[PDB]
A paper describes a structure:
The spike protein of [name]-[name]-2 is present on the virion surface as a trimer and mediates recognition of human angiotensin-converting enzyme 2 (ACE2) on the surface of host cells, subsequently triggering membrane fusion. The receptor-binding domain (RBD) localized on the N-terminal subunit (S1) mediates receptor binding and is a target of neutralizing antibodies. Nanobodies are ∼12 to 15 kDa in size, highly stable across a wide range of pH and temperature, display strong binding affinities to target proteins, and can be expressed with high yields in bacterial, yeast, and mammalian expression systems. We identified high-affinity nanobodies against [name]-[name]-2 receptor-binding domain and found that nanobody cocktails consisting of two noncompeting nanobodies were able to block ACE2 engagement with RBD variants present in human populations and potently neutralize both wild-type [name]-[name]-2 and the [name] [name] variant at low concentrations.
To visualize how the nanobodies bound to [name]-[name]-2 spike protein, we incubated [name] and [name] with the purified ectodomain of [name]-[name]-2 spike containing the six stabilizing proline mutations at a stochiometric ratio of 6:1 for 30 min at room temperature and applied to size-exclusion chromatography (SEC) to isolate the [name]-RBD complex. The cryo-EM structure of the complex was solved to an overall resolution of 3.8 Å, with each trimeric spike protein bound by six nanobodies, which represented the binding of both [name] and [name] to individual RBD domains. By applying focused classification to individual RBD-[name] complexes, their resolution was improved to 3.4 Å, sufficient for tracing the main chains and placement of most side chain rotamers. From the cryo-EM structure, [name] binding to RBD did not overlap with [name], which is consistent with the epitope mapping and SEC experiments. Binding of both [name] and [name] overlapped with the ACE2 binding site on the RBD (Right). The buried surface areas at the interface of [name]-RBD and [name]-RBD were 1016 Å2 and 816 Å2, respectively. The majority of contacts of [name] with the RBD are mediated by residues 108 and 109 of the complementarity-determining region (CDR) 3 loop, W113, and residues 43 to 47 of framework region (FR) 2.
Author numbering:
A (entry chain C): 2 to 130
B (entry chain B): 333 to 528
C (entry chain A): 1 to 123
The structure:
């Protein structure tokens, strides 16, 4: 399976961006796609996590209300829309996929850091003036 | 001469998940360890504290058979003094373990197109598991600052994770069935010996 | 770190001879169990043969006599030679690096796995 990252760019504070992640070769019936970020000097951190269906979206408290995760209806490509960016959000963003968990007739879609099976190459996003 | 029913363990139709590992006690019989060695299915046959040849010549009061399924690259964790998610949180062997570890590829039985989600492994726990302990709790594990009350969120994880076995997956990622034989010798008649 | 490359195979007539070759760079090849493993479609991996660091050899009942395994000196390639092939051998063959040094006869732990080639025996 291959994961590709695109849309990395330099924008002014308050601007918007759209990152894309191309998903290829996954035959899994139910998986989850997560967006992570890695800032200079700090460890990797989760930002978003969405189901293959796209019904469930989970966001970290810092990015809540500014980041929207969606899936295209005609392609297997997942988007992370970033509005009202702040300088502290500068980091390398990574796309990652993980299988969903089936237990007692209920599915769970989560993005645990240590459980991700595949990673993308990442793109740098810097927000300066 | 009645033999030890090793067939009921190795040829079981269904194998339990790693976190809820099944243990069967085998006692008061004789077992021929040479049906094991002279087989080609078993990719992994390693022993600790004893030597395969000696096994025929020794006696043991009780043999325990622990069985479960894990990933290929995770079999290396089923050994004394190893670390990793499986060894730390699911199944831990004591430092003075005396026994043999047997594993074989089971891709023909435990994989399915689209993924087999029924096998799970424990991914989160507050502290490292003590040797030969099987906690099967499924309470929400809180990893972040936010307190968790049973609703999974960004910082509230369900502690179990499905493997998602697929036939297309490479050999390193295919499912492997593991059986761990532990040899304990108590103060009692040792009725498990060699057949010679 | 360790890479195993499978060379040889293809379409061979019954009774044909195929010399499979793996080359492994990235570790001291001199002292580690190596072996060839077969995966007939519709089954799991079966361990055909292997050679230990001290020249001890192991064969399976199906392939006993038919096969020969060679471990090269001053090279990091193991050679597997099959003769009198019959339809039952159509499968994929992999190479494997045992994870511990100085193993003996009944101690096998094939952690590393190569990208096995497919051998087809038709007519």
């Amino acid at each position: 399976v291959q994961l590709q990252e695109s849309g990395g760019g330099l924008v002014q504070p308050g601007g918007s961006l759209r990152l894309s992640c191309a998903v290829s070769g996954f035959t899994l019936d139910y998986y989850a796609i997560g967006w992570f970020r890695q800032a200079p000097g700090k460890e990797r951190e989760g930002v978003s996590c969405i189901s293959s269906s796209g019904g469930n979206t989970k966001y970290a408290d810092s990015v809540k209300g500014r980041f929207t995760a969606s899936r295209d209806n005609a392609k297997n490509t997942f988007y992370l829309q970033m509005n009202s960016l702040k300088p502290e959000d500068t980091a390398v963003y990574y796309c990652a996929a993980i299988a969903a968990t089936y237990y007692s007739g209920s599915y769970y879609f989560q993005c645990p850091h240590d459980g991700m099976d595949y990673w993308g190459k990442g793109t740098q996003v810097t927000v300066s003036s | 001469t009645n033999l030890c029913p090793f067939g009921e363990v190795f040829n079981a139709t269904r194998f339990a998940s790693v976190y809820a590992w099944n243990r069967k006690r085998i006692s008061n019989c004789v077992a021929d360890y040479s049906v094991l060695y002279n087989s080609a299915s078993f990719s992994t046959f390693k022993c600790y504290g004893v030597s395969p040849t000696k096994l025929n010549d020794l006696c043991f009061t009780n043999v325990y058979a622990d069985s479960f399924v894990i990933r290929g690259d995770e079999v290396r964790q089923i050994a004394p003094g190893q670390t990793g998610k499986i060894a730390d949180y699911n199944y831990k062997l004591p430092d003075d373990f005396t026994g043999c570890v047997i594993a074989w590829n089971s891709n023909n039985l435990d994989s399915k197109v689209g993924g087999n989600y029924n096998y799970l492994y424990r991914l989160f726990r507050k502290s490292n598991l003590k040797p030969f302990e099987r906690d099967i709790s499924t309470e929400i594990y809180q990893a972040g600052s936010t307190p968790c009350n049973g609703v999974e969120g960004f910082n509230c994880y369900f502690p179990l994770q499905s493997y998602g076995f697929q036939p297309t997956n490479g050999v390193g990622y295919q499912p492997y069935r593991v059986v761990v034989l532990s040899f304990e010798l108590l103060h009692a008649p040792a009725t498990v010996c060699g057949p010679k | 770190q360790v890479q195993l490359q499978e060379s040889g195979g293809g379409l061979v007539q019954p009774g044909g001879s195929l010399r499979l070759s793996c080359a492994a760079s990235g570790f001291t090849f001199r002292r580690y169990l190596m072996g060839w493993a077969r995966q007939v479609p519709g089954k799991g991996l079966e361990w055909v043969s292997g050679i230990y660091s001290d020249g001890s050899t192991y064969y399976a009942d199906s392939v006993k006599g038919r096969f020969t395994i060679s471990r090269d000196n001053a090279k990091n390639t193991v050679y597997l030679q099959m003769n009198s092939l019959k339809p039952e051998d159509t499968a994929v063959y992999y190479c494997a690096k045992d994870r511990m040094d100085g193993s003996t006869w009944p101690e096998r732990d094939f952690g590393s796995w190569g990208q096995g080639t497919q051998v087809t025996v038709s007519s």
